[PDB]
Amino acid sequence: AKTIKITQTRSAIGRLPKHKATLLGLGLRRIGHTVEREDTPAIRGMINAVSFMVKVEE
Amino acid sequence: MFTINAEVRKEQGKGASRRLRAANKFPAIIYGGKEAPLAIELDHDKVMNMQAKAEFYSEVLTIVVDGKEIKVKAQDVQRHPYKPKLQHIDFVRA
Amino acid sequence: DKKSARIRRATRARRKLQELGATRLVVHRTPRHIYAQVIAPNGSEVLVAASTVEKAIAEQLKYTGNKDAAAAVGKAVAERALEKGIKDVSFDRSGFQYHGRVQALADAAREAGLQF
Amino acid sequence: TSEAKRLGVKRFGGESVLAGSIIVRQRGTKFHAGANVGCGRDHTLFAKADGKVKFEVKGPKNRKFISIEAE
RNA sequence: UGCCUGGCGGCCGUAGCGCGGUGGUCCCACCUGACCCCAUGCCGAACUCAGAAGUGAAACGCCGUAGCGCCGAUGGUAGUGUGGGGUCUCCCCAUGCGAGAGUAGGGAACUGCCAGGCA
RNA sequence: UCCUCCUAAAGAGUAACGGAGGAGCACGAAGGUUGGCUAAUCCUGGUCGGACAUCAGGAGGUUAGUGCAAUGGCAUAAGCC
RNA sequence: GGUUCUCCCCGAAAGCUAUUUAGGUAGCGCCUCGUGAAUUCAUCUCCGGGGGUAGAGCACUGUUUCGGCCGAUGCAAACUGCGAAUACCGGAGAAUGUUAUCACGGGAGACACACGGCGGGUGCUAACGUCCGUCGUGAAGAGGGAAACAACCCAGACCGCCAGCUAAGGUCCCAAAGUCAUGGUUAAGUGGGAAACGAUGUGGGAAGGCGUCGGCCUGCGCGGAAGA
């Protein structure tokens, strides 16, 4: 399906283990890092879970 | 008899409800019969003014949204525990 | 309260046989007629059923309900089971007492050569 | 004017519990054994054969039953 | 293949509670007596022996009564995970999940197999 | 030394001589199994009995009980001839 | 108390069960290296779960009150005819994660943690008092902001360049940036000290009164309001 760009905006220094695992799954390593991922329900769920620190090029 | 103006709902949820309350609007629901329920939005000031008359509980309400005539009756209303403001009303089509 | 008590008392064996999941032979007794049914473990199908009312076995019986009728029903059930291959079904008394017509029917069924 | 006992469900629905596994250890009888499930003296439910676990509601009283079905 | 009756399973208040009518064709029901197989913690109470000789009393199948009871929406309400803010004891903001009760609606259930009477 | 519900934020666990007592017994029958039975509670009738020393017609179906202080589930009673 | 040369990588805890024990003894929990093994494990989506916590209700166990224990209205830690979010177990699934998962062996290290956010107990529901379950920092994390300050906010420092951008915080100078605009509030330096009472101080808002006279709510100041 259509792919989207996901970019980190805020760090995960003080975030919960679940948030850290979500960031690791997204593959974002540093603030401002951008990755390309296919749009699927699981990706949408993860991005909604960590929406407070990730921007999406819808 | 009396003319009532409302807006068709587009967003559904507690977030939309809070948006309406902040913007001085409130949602309402009309049901009754095999037809599916309709959710509408109404201004708080107009409904507060209308509620003043004692004929509200005895008169059948007429709603005109997008040029459609809907006849309903006040099945139930929701009132805040201490704030004299209206937030939701359930109506049954007659 | 008679039929309810009978059903409740039969429910004991009814549930007990369920755990072992084996075909069951049940008997319904009435002065007018006697019925015998073979029920699979699932409990929704009957392998074979016989009734004293049917003329096929009531022709040689003076009355539908009696010891002779019970013996005839037992023999018919036994031979049908033998020709169908029931493989040694268990039996339930349906809350009755195993001293009269029930005992006669059981003895008649066992006479054919069953091992229940 | 002690040591707490370990209660609760150990294996839930969908677990491939094998023969001999205890499904739940409750004080009284919270659930009743159904098919291929045995009840101990101390009101403990255990499996009798390999299979998948399920919880069902049946009966006039609407009593909860624990059952095991072939996988 | 249609109506009625009995049994074997699922469903377990959309199957229940109260009221009126109908059911003896078949089936089911009251069992009279039992000194005989059987027995009463007294009682043939239940169970077992002979049916239409006596009837549908009570029980139970069906129709209506929506009176009581149940489920049941969309919607809203109370709450909460996550980040932030405030006057920080408590509340709000963007987003996700979403109470109970009640309203519209329903139903006097439905369904699979076997035996019998009327067609 | 050990149990009984909470605080203990709907898996388990999770505090301070925490809030609470009980057991350190008993039945060798109060154990096993077969048949049948299964209320409590209240109204109405009995010489007194009125509900309360016993019996039968009802309201109601697991509110009595299950050896124990307390606790959960229990009418398929896990009770009772 | 001391334990002396340098470099690279990895990288904890101050917790859980017993003690004629409370400073210790055993193991588990946490770390490192070597070998072996499954899409093993984490995240997110869907499916099957017991929930009995929040919310509600008095049908279940109790409680105050109403007409004279009967019926009802509200309430609950040893209350649920109902019932969340959230946590947890299993099955399937696109994708990422240097296998981050598990098994064995050697080596250890630690065994008075503090503070803060979230929901409570205790405490006089006075206390910057006390103990819990979870997350973050420090312990072992440099750097920027608030005056210094560790429990506050942003942000995990391989090295170097007289490069740009940005998070929190700011744009009158000290000290780098708006003496920028839009519609207002304040007359008191309130800002820059703090809650409970009252008020001919003021801007705004919904309703009164037979041209008329007054009531209610909201934002900012005042006497209580005092640190050597």
Domains (ranges, CATH) in chain D?
Answer: 8-69 (2.40.50.100)
CA dist list (Å): A1 to A26, A44, A49, B73: 17, 13, 21, 49
Q: Are C26 and C92 in contact (CB under 8 A)?
A: yes
Chains that touch B (3 or more CB pairs under 8 A): none
Instruction: Please name which of A24, A12, A22, A17 lies closest in space to residue A45, comparing C-alpha atoms.
Output: A22
CB A10 within 8 A of CB A39: no
The spacing between the Cα labelled CA in A11 and the C1' in G166, in angstroms, equals 13
Neighbours of A56 (CB within 10 A): 14
Overall domain count for chain C: 1
Chain D partners (3+ C-beta pairs within 8 A)? none
Q: Does domain A1-58 have CATH number 3.30.1390.20?
A: yes
Chains touching chain A through at least 3 C-beta pairs below 8 angstroms are: none
Cβ atoms B78, B87 nearer than 8 A: yes
Rounded to whole angstroms, the Cα distance separating D66 from D71 reads 15
Distance (Å) of CA D40 to CA D7, D46, D48, D53: 16, 8, 12, 18
CA–CA separation, D29 vs C101, rounded Å?
41
Q: Give the amino acid at B73.
A: K
Q: Alpha-carbon distance C25 to C39, whole Å?
A: 6
Handedness of CA D50, D54, D59, D62 (dihedral sign): positive
Domain of B7 in residue numbering reads as 1-94
| Sequence-distant (≥ 6) Cβ neighbours of residue C17 within 8 angstroms | C24, C41, C90, C92
Burial D15-32 (b: 16+ CB within 10 A, else e): bebeeebebbbeeeeebe
Point out the nucleotide closest to C14 (alpha carbon to C1′). Answer: F76
**Helix-helix angle A41-49:A17-26, to 10 degrees:** 140
Residues of B (40-69) placing their beta carbon closer than 7 angstroms to any atom of strand E are none
CB C96 within 8 A of CB C84: no
Q: CB-side exposure of A7: number of CA atoms within 13 Å? A: 8
What's the CATH code of the domain at C36? Answer: 3.30.420.100
Read off the tokens for C55. Answer: 């003329």
- Say how far C112 CA is from F35 C1', in Å: 29
Q: How far is CA C42 from the centre of its chain?
A: 18
Is the shortest CB-to-strand distance from A10 to strand G under 7 Å?
yes
Calpha distance C99→C78 (Å, rounded): 20
Tell me how far apart the alpha carbons of residues C8 and B11 are, in angstroms, rounded to a whole number.
57
Q: How was this structure determined?
A: cryo-EM
The amino acid at C5: A
Give, in order, the Cα–Cα distances in Å from C7 to each of B9, C11, C28, C90, D61.
58, 6, 11, 19, 17
Q: What is the 3-state secondary structure (H, E, C) of chain A?
A: CCEEEEEECCCCCCCCHHHHHHHHHHCCCCCCCEEEEECCHHHHHHHHHCHHHEEECC
> The domain spanning residue B91 has which CATH number?
2.40.240.10
Is the Cβ–Cβ distance between C69 and C105 less than 8 Å?
no
How many angstroms separate the CA atoms of C115 and B86, rounded?
80
Name the nucleotide nearest B31; use CA and C1'.
E104
For chain C residues 54-73, those near strand E by a CB cutoff of 7 A are: 54, 62-67
Residue C21 zone, left/alpha/beta (φ > 0; ψ -120 to 50; rest)? left
CA of D53 to C1' of F11 (A): 17
Question: CA triplet C15, C18, C24: central angle to 5 degrees?
Answer: 100
The reply to whether A18 has its C-beta less than 7 Å from any atom of strand G is yes
Amino acid symbol at C103: Q
| Angstrom distance, D48 CA to F3 C1' | 31
| CA C10 – CA C72 distance, rounded (Å) | 24
Q: How far apart are CA C32 and CA C6, in angstroms?
A: 18
